[PDB]
Nucleic acid binder design. Structure first.
Lengths: 236, 236
DNA sequence: TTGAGGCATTAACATTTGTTAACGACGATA
DNA sequence: TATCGTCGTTAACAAATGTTAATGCCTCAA
């Protein structure tokens, strides 16, 4: 993205350097809350939370370039206790103090409205996701997450659309939907295989009937059209 | 509180007159797409969306002062097709043309930070609500929604905390959690006053065991602590 | 006074999902 | 080569939710 490149150099010019992270690494976490602003430039990560009794919840994923902030700007207090785990081999993010940011955008407005732009994407993304998950229960929640993982990591293949995401276990699909038992997602998936909406091959997933998912995730598909026109138009 | 009143007068200074609204009439709807940036100053509203087959989804509630945007600041396209229904008897809001918006923040950046932090409060709220509504299914969803309503619309009484909302009919509660039939939500509420955490009096709700809700909505409870701490202190 | 419609309550029956266990496949290690 | 642990199915049963209908309370209108 061009907007994200102008923002990159704007930080390197102000003394900010990139930090390298590897898989399984947590940029920030829910136990050591330092108010950061992370400009994930290259890589993919998952935002997660862990209840007091050990339940995992994958709130969403983040494919760079994108902006995530663990603290407010004015008050500079925590916005919540979440973990930003790296799931690709390695990722490159520009970690900056929450107070440092205030001054940078105070001089450059075009970089201000860019951060405001991504946060607007965040909002509309959560509402659309909350909409489709809350309607058709769990079966619709799986159909919804898969639709998200195909407009981002989906590549047109001979037999369907392959989700190029490493180690997408059954557990990982459950944490994203609130399901805690892998036997429940397999059952939901077995229904999508008998309906041949999805086929399972080489520990990966290939989508055949993308419209079936759209029926259970209309507001989300609508979001990819309104918020990320590029990535959306690749499969329509 | 004060951060908004300061932003109130900044609009009148630039020639933005408040437009008053009355109950049951929509500011912006899903069918007619116009991008604005509403600054609700007084009154109660709910954000809604109607599925293709008439299914309704209440996404969340809004109480002035607060900001809502039906479009993007950079691309001026709609964030999504939603409806903002006024459910209070009367509500006043400063509707602004989104094109006129970006030019109004570039002048004073202290009000840019204000509108910015409200977005951060929206993102965190969306994540927290998504977290709790997904772990414990529908029963937790109702618990979560009720907890939200107690903090925002709660006044202590000798019989419990009074949820000062008109309507809040069985059907209106299910719309927020994602339940279609009023008998399903009544079955759940039957279990809550069975366990003696709430009671139905005067077609209105008195919650008597707030902590029971905190156990099913832990993320939402801490959101109020970190985001709106004044509201949190009124019941803690 | 009667009667119509809307809401809450409960039933009952179907469907979905939570939960645990057993089975078999696949890889890794010695 | 045998053996161990991880993950995907599948079964089986319990719990929760979807769904529809009936009943009773309440207001409104004539």
């Amino acid at each position: 993205n061009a907007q994200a490149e102008e923002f990159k150099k704007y930080l390197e010019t102000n003394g900010i350097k990139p930090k390298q992270f590897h898989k399984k690494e947590l940029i920030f976490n829910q136990w050591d809350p330092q108010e950061y602003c992370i400009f994930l430039y290259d890589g993919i990560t998952k935002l997660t939370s862990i209840s007091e009794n050990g339940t995992i919840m994958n709130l969403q994923y983040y494919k760079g370039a994108f902006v995530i902030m663990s603290g407010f700007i004015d008050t500079e207090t925590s916005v919540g206790y979440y973990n930003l785990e790296v799931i690709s081999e390695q990722a490159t993010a520009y970690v900056i103090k929450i107070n440092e940011l205030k001054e940078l955008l105070s001089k450059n407005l075009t970089h201000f409205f860019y951060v405001f732009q991504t946060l607007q994407k965040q909002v509309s993304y959560s509402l659309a996701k909350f909409n489709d998950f809350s309607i058709n229960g769990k079966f619709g929640s799986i159909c919804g997450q898969l639709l998200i993982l195909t407009y981002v990591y989906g590549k047109e293949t001979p037999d369907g659309i392959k989700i190029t995401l490493d180690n997408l276990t059954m557990q990982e699909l459950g944490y994203s939907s609130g399901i805690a038992h892998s036997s429940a997602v397999s059952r939901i998936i077995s229904k999508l295989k008998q309906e041949k909406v999805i086929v399972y091959k080489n520990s990966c997933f290939y989508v055949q009937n993308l419209d079936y998912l759209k029926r259970y995730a209309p507001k989300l598909d609508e979001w990819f059209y309104l918020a990320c026109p590029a990535t959306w138009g690749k499969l329509n």
